[PDB]
Amino acid sequence: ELVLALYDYQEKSPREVTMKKGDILTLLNSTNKDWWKVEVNDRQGFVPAAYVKKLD
């Protein structure tokens, strides 16, 4: 349910969100292997699964 951003990522498309290294994001949906939907600063969208780490 929470994930740590391991790298910066800037949205490159409408369904994407931007994040900074060290940001703590709310994990909305990780059914897809490559793209995870998250919430950052009351924005929602996708980031690469590999660029974040679950906390549990």
Domain ranges in the chain are: 1-56
Resolution for this experimental structure (Å): 2.1
- Method used to solve the structure: X-ray
* CB neighbour list of residue 27: distance below 8 Å, 6 or more residues apart: 1, 2, 3, 36, 37, 38, 54
Which single residue is written with the structure tokens 């060290």? Answer: 22
Q: For residue 35, which of 22, 24, 20, 12 has the smallest C-alpha distance?
A: 12
Alpha helices in the chain (DSSP H): none
Q: For residue 14, which of 39, 38, 44 has the smallest C-alpha distance?
A: 44
